[PDB]
Amino acid sequence: SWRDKSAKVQVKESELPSSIPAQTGLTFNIWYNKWSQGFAGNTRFVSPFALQPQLHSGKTRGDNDGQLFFCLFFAKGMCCLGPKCEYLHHIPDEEDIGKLALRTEVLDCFGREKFADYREDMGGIGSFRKKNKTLYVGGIDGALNSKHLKPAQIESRIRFVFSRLGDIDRIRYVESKNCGFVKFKYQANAEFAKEAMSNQTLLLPSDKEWDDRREGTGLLVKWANEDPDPAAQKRLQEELKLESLNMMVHLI
Amino acid sequence: EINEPPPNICEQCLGDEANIRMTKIPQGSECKICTLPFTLYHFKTSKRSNNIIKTLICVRCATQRNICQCCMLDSRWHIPIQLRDHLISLVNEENVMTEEAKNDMMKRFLSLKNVKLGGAQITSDPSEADNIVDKLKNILLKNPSTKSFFLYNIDASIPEWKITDTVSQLLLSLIVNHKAKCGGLRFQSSELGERFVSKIIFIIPWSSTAENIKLSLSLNKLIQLEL
Amino acid sequence: PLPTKAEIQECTARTKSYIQRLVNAKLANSNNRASSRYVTLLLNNSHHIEVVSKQMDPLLPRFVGKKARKVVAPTENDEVVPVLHMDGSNDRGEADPNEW
Amino acid sequence: LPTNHNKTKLLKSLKNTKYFQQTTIDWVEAGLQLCRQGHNMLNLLIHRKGLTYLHLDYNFNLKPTKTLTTKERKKSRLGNSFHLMRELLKMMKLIVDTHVQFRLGNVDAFQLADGIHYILNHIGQLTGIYRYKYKVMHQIRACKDLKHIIYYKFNKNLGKGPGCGFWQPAWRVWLNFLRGTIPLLERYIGNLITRQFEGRSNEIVKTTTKQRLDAYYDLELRNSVMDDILEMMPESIRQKKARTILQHLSEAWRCWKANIPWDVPGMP
RNA sequence: GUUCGCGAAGCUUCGUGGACAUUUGGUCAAUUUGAAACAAUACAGAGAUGAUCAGCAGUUCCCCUGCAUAAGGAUGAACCGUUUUACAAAGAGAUUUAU
RNA sequence: GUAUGUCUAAAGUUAUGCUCUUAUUUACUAACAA
Numbered sequence: 001s002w003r004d005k006s007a008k009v010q011v012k013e014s015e016l017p018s019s020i021p022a023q024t025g026l027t028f029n030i031w032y033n034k035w036s037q038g039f040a041g042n043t044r045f046v047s048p049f050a051l052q053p054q055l056h057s058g059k060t061r062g063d064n065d066g067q068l069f070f071c072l073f074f075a076k077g078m079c080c081l082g083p084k085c086e087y088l089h090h091i092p093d094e095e096d097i098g099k100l101a102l103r104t105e106v107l108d109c110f111g112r113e114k115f116a117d118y119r120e121d122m123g124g125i126g127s128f129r130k131k132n133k134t135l136y137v138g139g140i141d142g143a144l145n146s147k148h149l150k151p152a153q154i155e156s157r158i159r160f161v162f163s164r165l166g167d168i169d170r171i172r173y174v175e176s177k178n179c180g181f182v183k184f185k186y187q188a189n190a191e192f193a194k195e196a197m198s199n200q201t202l203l204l205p206s207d208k209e210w211d212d213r214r215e216g217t218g219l220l221v222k223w224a225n226e227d228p229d230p231a232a233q234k235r236l237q238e239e240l241k242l243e244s245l246n247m248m249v250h251l252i
Numbered sequence: 253e254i255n256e257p258p259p260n261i262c263e264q265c266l267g268d269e270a271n272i273r274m275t276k277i278p279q280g281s282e283c284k285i286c287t288l289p290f291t292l293y294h295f296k297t298s299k300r301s302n303n304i305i306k307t308l309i310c311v312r313c314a315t316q317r318n319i320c321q322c323c324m325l326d327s328r329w330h331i332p333i334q335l336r337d338h339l340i341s342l343v344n345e346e347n348v349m350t351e352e353a354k355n356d357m358m359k360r361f362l363s364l365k366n367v368k369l370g371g372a373q374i375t376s377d378p379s380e381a382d383n384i385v386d387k388l389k390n391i392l393l394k395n396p397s398t399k400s401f402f403l404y405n406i407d408a409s410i411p412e413w414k415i416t417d418t419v420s421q422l423l424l425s426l427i428v429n430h431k432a433k434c435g436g437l438r439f440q441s442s443e444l445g446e447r448f449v450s451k452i453i454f455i456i457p458w459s460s461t462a463e464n465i466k467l468s469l470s471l472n473k474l475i476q477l478e479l
Numbered sequence: 480p481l482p483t484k485a486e487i488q489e490c491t492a493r494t495k496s497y498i499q500r501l502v503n504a505k506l507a508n509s510n511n512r513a514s515s516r517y518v519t520l521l522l523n524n525s526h527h528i529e530v531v532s533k534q535m536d537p538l539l540p541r542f543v544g545k546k547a548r549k550v551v552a553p554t555e556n557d558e559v560v561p562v563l564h565m566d567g568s569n570d571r572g573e574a575d576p577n578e579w
Numbered sequence: 580l581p582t583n584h585n586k587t588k589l590l591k592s593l594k595n596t597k598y599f600q601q602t603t604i605d606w607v608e609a610g611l612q613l614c615r616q617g618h619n620m621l622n623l624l625i626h627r628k629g630l631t632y633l634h635l636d637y638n639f640n641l642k643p644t645k646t647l648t649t650k651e652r653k654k655s656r657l658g659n660s661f662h663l664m665r666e667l668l669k670m671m672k673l674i675v676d677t678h679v680q681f682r683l684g685n686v687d688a689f690q691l692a693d694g695i696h697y698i699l700n701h702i703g704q705l706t707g708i709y710r711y712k713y714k715v716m717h718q719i720r721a722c723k724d725l726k727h728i729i730y731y732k733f734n735k736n737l738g739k740g741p742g743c744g745f746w747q748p749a750w751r752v753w754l755n756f757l758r759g760t761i762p763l764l765e766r767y768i769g770n771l772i773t774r775q776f777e778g779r780s781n782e783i784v785k786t787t788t789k790q791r792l793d794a795y796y797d798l799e800l801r802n803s804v805m806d807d808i809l810e811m812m813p814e815s816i817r818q819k820k821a822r823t824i825l826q827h828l829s830e831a832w833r834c835w836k837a838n839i840p841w842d843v844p845g846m847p
Numbered sequence: 848g849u850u851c852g853c854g855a856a857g858c859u860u861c862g863u864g865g866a867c868a869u870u871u872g873g874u875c876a877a878u879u880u881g882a883a884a885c886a887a888u889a890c891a892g893a894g895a896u897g898a899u900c901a902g903c904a905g906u907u908c909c910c911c912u913g914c915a916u917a918a919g920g921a922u923g924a925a926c927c928g929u930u931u932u933a934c935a936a937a938g939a940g941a942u943u944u945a946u
Numbered sequence: 947g948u949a950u951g952u953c954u955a956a957a958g959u960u961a962u963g964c965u966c967u968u969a970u971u972u973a974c975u976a977a978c979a980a
């Protein structure tokens with residue numbers, strides 16, 4: 001278990017990467033940390049690190065404290081503070097979700113405030129106005145360096161990746177749209193994965209494009225608008241009703 | 253302007269201490285709703301609690317929604333605003349929404365208006381709240397060691413977490429597609445599979461009016477495959 | 480009745496207090512520390528709490544919030560008010576427009 | 580007469596807070612650190628503005644990197660606040676650098692003294708301070724005068740040459756100039772960084788000036804006339820019917836200008 | 848750990864009761880996905896009017912540069928589009944209906 | 947030649963009387979040549 005052992009360091013701050021990405025332009029902008037005098041070509045790239053959770057997850061300063069938030073850099077798999085980190089280092093569970101359930105309405109499991117609206121992409125941390133648990137998973141074409149895999153193969157690999165990080169409500173790959181819709185058990189979990197597999201690789205050691213994983217462009221894990229499909233809409237409605245019955249009985 | 257309105261923070265949120273010491277930065281942030289300066293209040297719930305609680309939204313916004321300024325929940329019932337609006341829509345009415353305008357200028361404008369939104373009109377006056385509650389209440393009343401199964405007859409609404417937890421109770425991996433319902437369950441060992449089977453909407457073969465069920469499965473499966 | 484002297488003292492006291500406070504607010508608001516020298520607890524339920532103002536670094540902006548937003552005002556004329564003129568001119572009122 | 584009520588100094592105020600600490604640092608260290616600090620500040624400001632194409636040199640001599648597009652050029656005309664700040668830092672950077680040189684084993688103390696003196700008497704010639712704030716000519720002139728005075732009390736029996744130091748009175752001049760300007764720059768750069776952070780005020784309203792006096796006058800006039808006519812007019816006519824009125828007025832004005840009588844028949 | 852009282856070994860040492868001192872900081876957390884802005888390549892290249900020119904205004908839920916209530920951004924930009932009813936009264940002719 | 951203004955800068959949001967052929971004018975425009 002995670003609770004059996006202390007959390008290992010993801011990567012030592014020597015191994016950590018600098019804040020000077022890619023020279024996308026002609027000159028560096030000090031107050032922005034971005035580049036400038038040229039926006040030729042796309043910015044995004046593939047994460048060097050990944051949350052290998054059983055090899056990494058463990059105790060922290062936080063697990064002593066009762067810090068209610070998980071380490072963004074743990075999710076990214078690059079936390080340079082291992083056991084000395086205040087933010088936690090393990091997969092969110094019912095106990096921890098339950099623990100922070102008050103605050104998590106307003107903000108993420110990464111302890112950062114949600115907003116009125118989704119960022120037009122549905123790309124950034126979720127809005128407070130929706131309690132979404134469903135991540136859109138674009139850029140699979142890019143995430144596998146143009147590997148002509150089977151849809152079954154794709155969906156299975158996706159399953160392997162996101163099931164590892166959180167309890168699944170459902171997943172469904174769409175051949176016609178080349179993307180995923182990865183509904184989660186909890187919003188905290190959803191948040192965690194959404195960072196934990198942002199800019200990651202779907203590739204594996206068994207695959208031949210393993211050393212070219214860095215060179216492509218990573219998974220585009222964003223948030224999902226609810227489907228137009230009335231097949232699931234009805235289900236959603238039913239769920240809402242059920243939940244409402246719970247709370248309403250709880251009021252008295 | 254003058255600090256005329258007081259902050260609108262709820263109890264649960266704020267924590268069970270007789271006296272906390274919070275700080276107020278006036279004109280201290282744009283809110284999370286209406287992009288508009290307001291007096292940001294914040295406090296650690298306990299002295300040694302690491303998480304500060306800062307007042308996300310502005311007081312006008314809070315009043316408007318009739319909510320907490322830190323929780324974003326109704327100050328009465330401590331529940332999500334959308335959810336409470338749904339509840340209100342359900343009892344006594346058919347339609348009660350609280351539409352926030354997603355355009356940066358208009359949101360400000362809306363915030364400025366001293367007018368309660370749909371659900372807020374109910375929950376403000378406690379009498380009406382009580383009435384709503386009572387109305388709601390009224391409304392209420394053979395083991396070959398395969399380690400790998402293929403489960404069928406899966407209710408469309410059921411989630412994988414429910415399944416796996418059920419299995420655990422009766423005790424790993426799992427694959428489900430709600431289109432096909434070809435629940436490609438796989439156990440971490442064959443001995444575990446044996447244990448499970450020996451321990452036994454649970455239609456369960458061990459591949460590696462049931463007829464009509466098979467047909468329904470069939471067509472659905474086919475459709476899934478075409479997708 | 481021309482207003483009572485005592486009540487004038489009241490009004491003056493109220494409004495003077497108000498405007499002095501407003502001007503103070505205006506002054507301590509502004510970045511010019513020069514104009515800081517012309518400046519003339521709570522409970523959020525039955526539950527009780529101490530409010531404080533933490534002094535911040537005098538480099539960072541004093542009021543991070545304010546950023547000169549354009550904001551349209553809602554009128555908030557919730558109460559209706561008449562516009563109420565008493566006349567009915569026919570002879571001069573119709574003969575005039577031909578001239579006007 | 581210095582005003583007495585304001586007995587909360589700047590340093591005192593800063594001391595009161597937590598965010599400052601105090602140390603005993605060598606004056607050269609203070610200087611160098613302040614050049615570094617100043618450089619970081621100005622670069623931060625410039626980059627914040629967006630115009631990364633203006634490269635600050637470490638000697639506070641600003642210049643553009645690329646040839647500037649007209650838009651870019653317009654953007655990059657930094658005002659009399661930022662440039663003035665730069666110039667003061669340039670001044671400081673000079674003398675501090677000279678001290679560094681002295682102390683870095685390069686130059687003798689006499690050489691240092693002469694260097695400092697040279698800097699003070701040639702602030703004009705070493706940093707275009709005058710460019711931005713021209714009243715600094717007074718200061719420059721004063722320094723020149725001092726030099727003229729000093730030298731000819733310093734070179735009575737001694738011949739000509741550059742080797743005089745004695746930088747005191749000029750230094751005094753510069754200190755008093757800084758005293759004068761510290762308020763001005765607090766205001767100026769205050770407003771500047773406020774604009775960088777908060778947007779500029781959108782209640783701009785322009786005053787009258789010699790340049791826009793006439794236009795304002797005439798608009799006020801036509802507003803008055805229009806008002807009067809509406810007051811007069813018993814039907815309560817539309818704004819479009821006021822257009823006819825004011826246009827009529829305009830024509831009348833022109834007619835008057837011509838000395839052609841303005842006798843339109845159909846009017847009341 | 849200092850010190851002030853006590854006890855147990857030799858003014859020295861081990862144990863005991865005190866006094867002193869007794870709540871830091873965070874609105875933030877390390878790169879993509881919570882927000883800049885130009886830049887480049889391409890395309891056009893500027894208000895009156897025939898043509899060439901100075902402008903100053905105005906409205907704007909547009910701003911930028913500027914210390915700015917100077918001024919300047921092409922007269923800073925956009926304004927040039929769309930456009931039906933407080934709809935009446937009178938007469939004549941034709942059609943229908945009724946008495 | 948410019949101000950200025952648009953444009954591009956890549957990842958897939960889960961629903962079933964005429965045609966013709968020419969030659970000439972005039973005008974405007976043209977950082978194209980003289």
Ligand SMILES: O=P(O)(O)O[C@H]1[C@H](OP(=O)(O)O)[C@@H](OP(=O)(O)O)[C@H](OP(=O)(O)O)[C@@H](OP(=O)(O)O)[C@H]1OP(=O)(O)O
Nearest residue numbers: 697700701704723726727730731734738739740741742743
């Ligand atoms: O009068 P200014 O224009 O300020 O110039 C003076 C002046 O030179 P001129 O007389 O040629 O103008 C001084 O010369 P004297 O009158 O003293 O002969 C000379 O002083 P030194 O002779 O002591 O050199 C000084 O030069 P420096 O700055 O090297 O001391 C120089 O100032 P500029 O060099 O700035 O013109």
Ligand SMILES: [K+]
Nearest residue numbers: 919920922923
């Ligand atoms: K102008």
Ligand SMILES: [K+]
Nearest residue numbers: 904905922923
């Ligand atoms: K104008």
Ligand SMILES: [Mg+2]
Nearest residue numbers: 919920921922
């Ligand atoms: Mg011009």
Ligand SMILES: [Mg+2]
Nearest residue numbers: 901902921922
């Ligand atoms: Mg011009």
Ligand SMILES: [Zn+2]
Nearest residue numbers: 071079081085
């Ligand atoms: Zn960590």
Ligand SMILES: [Zn+2]
Nearest residue numbers: 262265320323
């Ligand atoms: Zn609350």
Ligand SMILES: [Zn+2]
Nearest residue numbers: 283286310313
């Ligand atoms: Zn608000």
